[PDB]
Structures are given as C-alpha cells and as structure tokens.
PDB file of C-alpha atoms and ligand atoms in Angstrom:
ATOM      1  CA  UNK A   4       0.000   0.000   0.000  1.00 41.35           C
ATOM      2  CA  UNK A   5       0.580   3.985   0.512  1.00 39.94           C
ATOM      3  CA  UNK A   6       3.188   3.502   3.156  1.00 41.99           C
ATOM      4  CA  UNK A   7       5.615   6.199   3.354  1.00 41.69           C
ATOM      5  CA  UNK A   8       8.102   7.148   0.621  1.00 42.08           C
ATOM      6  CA  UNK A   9       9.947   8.993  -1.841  1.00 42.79           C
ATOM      7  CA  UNK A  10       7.132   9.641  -5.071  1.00 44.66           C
ATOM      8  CA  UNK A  11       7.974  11.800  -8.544  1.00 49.67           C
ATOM      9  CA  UNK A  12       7.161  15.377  -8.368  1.00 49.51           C
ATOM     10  CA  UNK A  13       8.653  17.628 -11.622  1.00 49.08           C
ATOM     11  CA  UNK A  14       8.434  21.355 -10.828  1.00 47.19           C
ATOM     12  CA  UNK A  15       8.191  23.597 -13.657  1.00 47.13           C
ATOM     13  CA  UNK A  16       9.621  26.990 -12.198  1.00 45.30           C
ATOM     14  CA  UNK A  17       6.733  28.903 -14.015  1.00 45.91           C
ATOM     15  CA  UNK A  18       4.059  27.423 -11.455  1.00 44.19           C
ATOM     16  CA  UNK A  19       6.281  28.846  -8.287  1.00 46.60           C
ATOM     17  CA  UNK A  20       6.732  32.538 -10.560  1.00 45.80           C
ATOM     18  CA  UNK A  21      10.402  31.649 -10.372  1.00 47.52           C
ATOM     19  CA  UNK A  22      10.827  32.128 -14.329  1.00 47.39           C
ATOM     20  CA  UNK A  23      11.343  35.238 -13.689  1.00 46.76           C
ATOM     21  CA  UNK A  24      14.218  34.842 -12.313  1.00 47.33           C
ATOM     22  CA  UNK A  25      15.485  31.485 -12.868  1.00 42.10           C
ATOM     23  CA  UNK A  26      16.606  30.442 -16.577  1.00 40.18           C
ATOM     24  CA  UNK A  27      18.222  26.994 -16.925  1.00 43.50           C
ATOM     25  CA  UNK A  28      16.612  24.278 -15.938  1.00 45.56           C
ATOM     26  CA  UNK A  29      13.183  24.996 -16.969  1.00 45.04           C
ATOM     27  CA  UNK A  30      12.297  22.670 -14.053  1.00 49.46           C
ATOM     28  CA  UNK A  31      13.523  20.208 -12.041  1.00 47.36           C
ATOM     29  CA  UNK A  32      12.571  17.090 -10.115  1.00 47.34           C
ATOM     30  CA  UNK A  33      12.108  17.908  -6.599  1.00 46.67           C
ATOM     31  CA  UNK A  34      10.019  14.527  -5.989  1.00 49.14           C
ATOM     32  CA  UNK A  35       7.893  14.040  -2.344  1.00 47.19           C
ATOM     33  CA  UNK A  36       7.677  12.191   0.753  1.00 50.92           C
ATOM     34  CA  UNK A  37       4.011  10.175   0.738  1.00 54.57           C
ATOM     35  CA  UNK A  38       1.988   7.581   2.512  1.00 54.32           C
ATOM     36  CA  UNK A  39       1.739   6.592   5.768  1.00 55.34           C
ATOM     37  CA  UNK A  40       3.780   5.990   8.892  1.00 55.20           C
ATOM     38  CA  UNK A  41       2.143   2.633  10.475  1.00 56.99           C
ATOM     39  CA  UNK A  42       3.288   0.642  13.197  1.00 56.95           C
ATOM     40  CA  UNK A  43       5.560  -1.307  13.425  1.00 56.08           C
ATOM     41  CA  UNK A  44       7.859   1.748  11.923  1.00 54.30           C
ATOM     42  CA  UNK A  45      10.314   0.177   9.241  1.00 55.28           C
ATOM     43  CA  UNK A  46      14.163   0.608   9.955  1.00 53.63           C
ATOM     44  CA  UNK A  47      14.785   2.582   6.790  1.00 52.70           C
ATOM     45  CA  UNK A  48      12.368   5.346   7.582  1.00 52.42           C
ATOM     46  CA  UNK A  49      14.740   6.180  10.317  1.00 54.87           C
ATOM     47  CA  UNK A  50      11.937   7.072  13.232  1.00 55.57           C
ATOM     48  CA  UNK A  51      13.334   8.722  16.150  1.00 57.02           C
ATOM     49  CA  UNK A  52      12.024   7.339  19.572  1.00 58.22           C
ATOM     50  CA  UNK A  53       9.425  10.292  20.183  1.00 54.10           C
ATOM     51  CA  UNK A  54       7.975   9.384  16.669  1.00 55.22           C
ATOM     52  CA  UNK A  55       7.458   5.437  18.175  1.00 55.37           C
ATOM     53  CA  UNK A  56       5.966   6.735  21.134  1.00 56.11           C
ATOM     54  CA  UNK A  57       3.730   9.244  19.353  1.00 56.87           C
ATOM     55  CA  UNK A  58       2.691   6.177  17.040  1.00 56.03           C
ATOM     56  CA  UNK A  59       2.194   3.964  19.648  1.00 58.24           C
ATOM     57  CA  UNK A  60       0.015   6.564  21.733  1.00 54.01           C
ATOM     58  CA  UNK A  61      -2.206   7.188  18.936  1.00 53.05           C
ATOM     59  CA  UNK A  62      -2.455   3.066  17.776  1.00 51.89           C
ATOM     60  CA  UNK A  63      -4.435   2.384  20.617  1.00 48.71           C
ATOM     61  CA  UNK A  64      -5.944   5.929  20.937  1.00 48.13           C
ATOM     62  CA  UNK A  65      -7.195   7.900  17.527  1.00 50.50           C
ATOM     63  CA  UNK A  66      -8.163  10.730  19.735  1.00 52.08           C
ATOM     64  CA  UNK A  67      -4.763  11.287  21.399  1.00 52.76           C
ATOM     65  CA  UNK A  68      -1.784  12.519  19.288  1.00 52.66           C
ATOM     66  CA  UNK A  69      -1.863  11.547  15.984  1.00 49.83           C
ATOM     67  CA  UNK A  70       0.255   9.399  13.317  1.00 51.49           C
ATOM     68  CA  UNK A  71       3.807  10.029  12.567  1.00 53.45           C
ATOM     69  CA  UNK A  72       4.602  12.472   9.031  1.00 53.07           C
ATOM     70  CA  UNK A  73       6.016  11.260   6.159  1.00 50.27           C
ATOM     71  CA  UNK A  74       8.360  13.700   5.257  1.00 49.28           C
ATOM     72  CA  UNK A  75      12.330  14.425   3.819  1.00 51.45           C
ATOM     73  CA  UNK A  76      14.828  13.543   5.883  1.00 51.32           C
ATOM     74  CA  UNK A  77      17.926  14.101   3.492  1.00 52.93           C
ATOM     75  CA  UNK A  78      18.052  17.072   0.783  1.00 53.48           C
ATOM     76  CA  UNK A  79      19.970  17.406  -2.221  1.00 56.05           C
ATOM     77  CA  UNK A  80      21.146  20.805  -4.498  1.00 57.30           C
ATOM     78  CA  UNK A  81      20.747  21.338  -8.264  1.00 58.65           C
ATOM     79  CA  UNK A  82      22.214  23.441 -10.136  1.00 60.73           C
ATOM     80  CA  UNK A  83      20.328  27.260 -11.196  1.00 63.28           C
ATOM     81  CA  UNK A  84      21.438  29.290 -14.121  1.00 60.85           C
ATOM     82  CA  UNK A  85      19.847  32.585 -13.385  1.00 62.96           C
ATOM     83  CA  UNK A  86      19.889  36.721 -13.645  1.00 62.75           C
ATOM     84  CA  UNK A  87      21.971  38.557 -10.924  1.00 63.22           C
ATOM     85  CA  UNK A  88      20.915  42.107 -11.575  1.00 61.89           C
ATOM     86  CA  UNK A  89      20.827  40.996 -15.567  1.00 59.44           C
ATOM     87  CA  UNK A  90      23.923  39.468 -15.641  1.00 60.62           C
ATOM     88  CA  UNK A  91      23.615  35.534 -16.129  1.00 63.06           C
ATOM     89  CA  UNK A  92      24.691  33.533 -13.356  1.00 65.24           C
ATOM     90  CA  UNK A  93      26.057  30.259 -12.249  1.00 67.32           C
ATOM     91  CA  UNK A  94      25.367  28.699  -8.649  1.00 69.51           C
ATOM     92  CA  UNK A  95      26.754  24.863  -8.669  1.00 71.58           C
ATOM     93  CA  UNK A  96      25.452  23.804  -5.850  1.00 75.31           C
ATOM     94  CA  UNK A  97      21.835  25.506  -4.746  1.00 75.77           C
ATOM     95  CA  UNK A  98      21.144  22.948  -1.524  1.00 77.99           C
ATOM     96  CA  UNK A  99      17.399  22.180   0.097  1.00 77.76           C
ATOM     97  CA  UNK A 100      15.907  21.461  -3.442  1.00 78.55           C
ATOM     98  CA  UNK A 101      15.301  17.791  -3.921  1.00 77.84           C
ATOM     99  CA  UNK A 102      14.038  14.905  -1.773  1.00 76.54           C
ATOM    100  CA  UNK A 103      16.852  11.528  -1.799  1.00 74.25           C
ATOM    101  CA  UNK A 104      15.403  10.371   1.460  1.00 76.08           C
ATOM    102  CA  UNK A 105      12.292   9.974   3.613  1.00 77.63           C
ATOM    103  CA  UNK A 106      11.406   9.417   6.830  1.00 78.31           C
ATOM    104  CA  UNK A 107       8.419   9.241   9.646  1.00 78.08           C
ATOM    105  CA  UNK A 108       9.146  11.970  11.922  1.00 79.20           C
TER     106      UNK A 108
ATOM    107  CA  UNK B   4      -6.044  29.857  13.440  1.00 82.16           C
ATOM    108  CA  UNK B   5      -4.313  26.270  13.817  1.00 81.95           C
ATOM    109  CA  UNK B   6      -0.760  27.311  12.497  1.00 86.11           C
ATOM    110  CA  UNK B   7       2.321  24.547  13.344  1.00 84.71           C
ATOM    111  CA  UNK B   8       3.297  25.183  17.148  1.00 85.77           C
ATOM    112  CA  UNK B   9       3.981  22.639  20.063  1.00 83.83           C
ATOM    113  CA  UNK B  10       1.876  20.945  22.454  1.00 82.35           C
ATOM    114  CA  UNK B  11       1.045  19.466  25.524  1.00 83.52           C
ATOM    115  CA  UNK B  12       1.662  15.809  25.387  1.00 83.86           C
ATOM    116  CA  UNK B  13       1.827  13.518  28.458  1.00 83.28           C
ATOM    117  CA  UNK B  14       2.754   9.930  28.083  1.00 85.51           C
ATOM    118  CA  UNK B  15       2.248   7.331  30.471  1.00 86.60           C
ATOM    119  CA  UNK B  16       4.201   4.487  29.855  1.00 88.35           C
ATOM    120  CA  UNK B  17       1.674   1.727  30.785  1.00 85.71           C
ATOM    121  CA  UNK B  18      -0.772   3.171  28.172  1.00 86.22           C
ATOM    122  CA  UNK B  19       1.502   2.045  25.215  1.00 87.72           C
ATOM    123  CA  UNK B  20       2.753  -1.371  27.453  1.00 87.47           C
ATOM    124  CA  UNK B  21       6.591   0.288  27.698  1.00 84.68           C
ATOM    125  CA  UNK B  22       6.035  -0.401  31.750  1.00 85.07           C
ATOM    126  CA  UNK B  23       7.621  -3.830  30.693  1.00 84.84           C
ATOM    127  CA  UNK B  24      10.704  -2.703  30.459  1.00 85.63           C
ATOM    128  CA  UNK B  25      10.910   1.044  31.637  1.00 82.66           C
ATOM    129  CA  UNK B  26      11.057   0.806  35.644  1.00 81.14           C
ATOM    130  CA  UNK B  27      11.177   4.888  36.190  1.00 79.84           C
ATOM    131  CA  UNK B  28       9.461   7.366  35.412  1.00 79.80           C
ATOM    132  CA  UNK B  29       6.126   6.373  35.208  1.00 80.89           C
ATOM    133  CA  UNK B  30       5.442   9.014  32.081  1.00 82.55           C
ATOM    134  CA  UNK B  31       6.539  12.143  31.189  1.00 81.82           C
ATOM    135  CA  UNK B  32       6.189  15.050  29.222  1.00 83.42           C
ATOM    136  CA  UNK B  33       6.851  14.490  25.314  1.00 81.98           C
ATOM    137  CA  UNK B  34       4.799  17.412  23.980  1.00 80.97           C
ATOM    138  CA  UNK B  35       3.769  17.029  20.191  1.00 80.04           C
ATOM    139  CA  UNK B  36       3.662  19.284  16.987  1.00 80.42           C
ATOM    140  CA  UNK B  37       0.263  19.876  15.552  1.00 82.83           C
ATOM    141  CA  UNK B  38      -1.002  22.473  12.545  1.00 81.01           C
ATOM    142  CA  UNK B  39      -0.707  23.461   9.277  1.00 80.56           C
ATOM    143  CA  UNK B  40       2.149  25.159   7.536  1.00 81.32           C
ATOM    144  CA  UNK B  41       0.723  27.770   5.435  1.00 79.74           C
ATOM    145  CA  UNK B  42       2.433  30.004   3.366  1.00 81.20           C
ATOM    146  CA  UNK B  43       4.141  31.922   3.850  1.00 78.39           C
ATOM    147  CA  UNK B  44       6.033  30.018   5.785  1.00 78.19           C
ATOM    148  CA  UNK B  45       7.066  31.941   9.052  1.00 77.55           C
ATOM    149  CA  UNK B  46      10.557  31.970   9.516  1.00 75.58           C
ATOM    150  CA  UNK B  47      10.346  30.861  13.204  1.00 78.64           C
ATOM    151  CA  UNK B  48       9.419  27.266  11.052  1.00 81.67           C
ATOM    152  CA  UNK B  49      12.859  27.294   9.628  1.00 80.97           C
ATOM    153  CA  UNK B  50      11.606  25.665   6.396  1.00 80.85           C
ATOM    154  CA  UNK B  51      13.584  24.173   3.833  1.00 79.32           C
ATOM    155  CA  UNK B  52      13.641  25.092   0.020  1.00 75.04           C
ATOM    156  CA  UNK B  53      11.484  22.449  -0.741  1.00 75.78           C
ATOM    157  CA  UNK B  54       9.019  22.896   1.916  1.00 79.31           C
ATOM    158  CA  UNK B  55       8.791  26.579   0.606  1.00 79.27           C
ATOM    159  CA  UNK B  56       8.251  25.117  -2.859  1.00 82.88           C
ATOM    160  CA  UNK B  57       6.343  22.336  -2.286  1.00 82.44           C
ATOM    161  CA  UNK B  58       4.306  24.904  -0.670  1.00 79.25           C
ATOM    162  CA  UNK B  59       3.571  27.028  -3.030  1.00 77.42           C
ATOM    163  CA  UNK B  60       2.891  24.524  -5.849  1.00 74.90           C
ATOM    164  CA  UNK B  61       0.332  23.220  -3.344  1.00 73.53           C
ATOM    165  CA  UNK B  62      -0.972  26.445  -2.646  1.00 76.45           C
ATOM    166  CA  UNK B  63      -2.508  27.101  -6.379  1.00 74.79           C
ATOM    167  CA  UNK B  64      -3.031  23.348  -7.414  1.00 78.92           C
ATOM    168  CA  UNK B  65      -4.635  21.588  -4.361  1.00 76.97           C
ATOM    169  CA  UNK B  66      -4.529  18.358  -6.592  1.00 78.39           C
ATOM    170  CA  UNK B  67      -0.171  18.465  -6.801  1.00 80.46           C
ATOM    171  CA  UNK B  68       2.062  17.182  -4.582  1.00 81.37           C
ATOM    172  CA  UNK B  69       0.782  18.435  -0.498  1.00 76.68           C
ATOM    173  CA  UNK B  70       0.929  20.985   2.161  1.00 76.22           C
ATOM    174  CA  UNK B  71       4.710  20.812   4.049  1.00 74.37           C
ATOM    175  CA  UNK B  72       4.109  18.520   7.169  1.00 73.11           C
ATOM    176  CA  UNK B  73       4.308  20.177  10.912  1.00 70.70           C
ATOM    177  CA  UNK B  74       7.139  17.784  12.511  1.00 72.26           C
ATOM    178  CA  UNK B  75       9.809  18.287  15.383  1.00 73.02           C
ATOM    179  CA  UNK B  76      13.153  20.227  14.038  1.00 73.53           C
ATOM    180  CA  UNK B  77      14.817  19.557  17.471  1.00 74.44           C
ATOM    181  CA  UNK B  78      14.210  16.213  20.619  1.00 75.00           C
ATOM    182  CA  UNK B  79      15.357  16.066  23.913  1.00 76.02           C
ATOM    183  CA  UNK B  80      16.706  13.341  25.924  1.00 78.81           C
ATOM    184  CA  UNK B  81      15.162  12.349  28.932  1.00 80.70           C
ATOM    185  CA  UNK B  82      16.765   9.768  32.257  1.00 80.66           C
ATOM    186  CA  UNK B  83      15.148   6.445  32.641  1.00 80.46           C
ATOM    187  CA  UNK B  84      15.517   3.525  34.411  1.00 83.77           C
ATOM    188  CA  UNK B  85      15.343   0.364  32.622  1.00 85.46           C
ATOM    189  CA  UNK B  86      16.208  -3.423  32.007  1.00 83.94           C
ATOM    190  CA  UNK B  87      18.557  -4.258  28.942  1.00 83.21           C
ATOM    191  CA  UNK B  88      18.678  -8.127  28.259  1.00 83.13           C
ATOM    192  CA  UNK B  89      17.401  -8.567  31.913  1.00 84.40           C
ATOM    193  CA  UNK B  90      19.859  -5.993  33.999  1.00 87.54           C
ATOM    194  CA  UNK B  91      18.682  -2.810  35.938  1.00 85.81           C
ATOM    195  CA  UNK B  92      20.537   0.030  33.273  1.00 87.28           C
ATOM    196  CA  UNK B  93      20.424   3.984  33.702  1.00 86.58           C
ATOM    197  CA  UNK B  94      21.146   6.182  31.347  1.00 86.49           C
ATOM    198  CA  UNK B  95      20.967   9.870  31.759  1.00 86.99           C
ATOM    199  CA  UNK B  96      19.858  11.313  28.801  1.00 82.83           C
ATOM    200  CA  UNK B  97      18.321   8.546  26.818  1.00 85.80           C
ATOM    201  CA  UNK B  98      18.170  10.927  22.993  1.00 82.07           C
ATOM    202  CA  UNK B  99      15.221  11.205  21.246  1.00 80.72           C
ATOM    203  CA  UNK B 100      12.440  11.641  23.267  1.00 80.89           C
ATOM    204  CA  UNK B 101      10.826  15.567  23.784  1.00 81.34           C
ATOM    205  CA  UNK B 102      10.147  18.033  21.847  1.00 83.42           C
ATOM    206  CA  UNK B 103      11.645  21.187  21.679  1.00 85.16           C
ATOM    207  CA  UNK B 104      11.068  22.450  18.422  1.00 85.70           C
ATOM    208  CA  UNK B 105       8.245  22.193  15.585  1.00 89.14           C
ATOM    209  CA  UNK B 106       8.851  23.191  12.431  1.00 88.82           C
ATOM    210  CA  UNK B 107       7.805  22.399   8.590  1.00 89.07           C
ATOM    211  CA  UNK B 108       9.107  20.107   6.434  1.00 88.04           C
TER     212      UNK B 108
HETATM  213 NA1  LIG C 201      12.124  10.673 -12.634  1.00 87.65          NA
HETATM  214 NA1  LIG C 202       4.699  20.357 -14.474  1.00 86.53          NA
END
C-alpha cells in the first residue's frame, strides 16, 4: 500500500513565478515524501524514539496525538542558471531542493 | 487559526505497554507538533527550500504534490531507568524523546 516514501514530483519553475528569475533548468525534479507511517515503523524510515511513542500513543488511541509524518529527511542541491541584476549567473550547488530520502518523523 | 506550534503531550508508559521494560518514570512530558504550515512560511518554522516550494505549488493546485508537514526540528533526551537483556541500566539522557522544536518540512 501507501506507506511512506519517496514519489515523482517535476516542478516547472513557471508554477512557483520563479521564471522570472530562474533560466536553466526549466524545471527540475524535486520529488515528495508520501503515505503513511504505520506501526511497526520500518528501519529505513529512520523514526526517532518520540515518533514510536507518538505512534504507539495514537495506535491504541485515535483521539490522542496523531500518526507520525512522512516527510524528507535528506536534501539534495541542483544546479540554477539565473539573472543577478541581468547578468547571467552560475550557482553549482543551490542545496534544500530535492528529496533523496524519507522518513516518519 | 491552527498554524504549526507545540503541544502538551503527556505519556504514560503503561498506556503504550513500555512499563515492561521502563522501571522509572512512570510518564513524562513528550509534547507534540500539531497544525498546518501555510504560506508563507514563518521563519520561526525554519523551512527548507522544498518545503517553501512544495508549498507554493500546493498552494494554487490543491490536486499536486501536499501541504509541508508540521514535525519536530529539534528532541530532547530524557533519564530512565530500565532493564537491557534482563539488567537494571540507567542512562541519563536517553536521545530522542521531547520536543523542543516544531517546524515544517
Ligand atoms: Na524521474
Ligand atoms: Na509540471
């Protein structure tokens, strides 16, 4: 089923109003964390101990806490070619923009 | 409204069966994070690029990708007493286990 992980997601940088700014790549894939975090959490969605106990609360009580979130837990850069005060740009390394990792948290 | 913030969250240890093994304390105080990250994202949320741009895709297409996730940024350790393999262990700051900070992600 939908348990939690890493799922497609292409961002064209005309949807954000980044064009105007931005002008290589066109778009990139950033991709998403879905799905759910269900009990037992598996090793490679790296809980931490307050997201077993918050699971754990809630398995036995929907009204009390609530489920773990899938979400990134490791970031990687890409690469922008863009205008700095209209002269074109180069920035290698541009971190925080795509998911390689998700976790329950 | 509901924006992403901590919480009050008690846990006793019996209601999730962890009274097996933990001897002391009987609960404590784990707090939880709970609400939505709406943009813009504050800046007390510290969110990442991709939260920020996940976002804001979000934001004008509610049928692409999601809203960032409200999650704790930063845990606490706690002391417990407890049996390992069948011996009475303490440890003073067992990692992992409080919140101290919410943000989105
Ligand atoms: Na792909
Ligand atoms: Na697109």
């Amino acid at each position: 089923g939908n348990y939690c992980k890493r799922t497609p997601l292409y961002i064209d940088f005309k949807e954000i109003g980044w064009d105007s700014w931005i002008i290589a790549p066109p778009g990139y894939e950033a991709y998403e964390c879905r799905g759910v975090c269900f009990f037992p959490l598996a090793e490679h969605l790296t809980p931490t101990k307050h997201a077993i106990i918050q699971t754990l609360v809630h398995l036995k009580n929907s009204q009390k806490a609530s489920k773990a979130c899938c979400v990134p837990t490791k970031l990687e850069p890409i690469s922008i070619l863009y205008l700095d005060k209209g002269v074109v740009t180069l920035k290698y390394k541009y971190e925080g923009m795509a998911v390689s990792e998700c976790g329950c948290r």
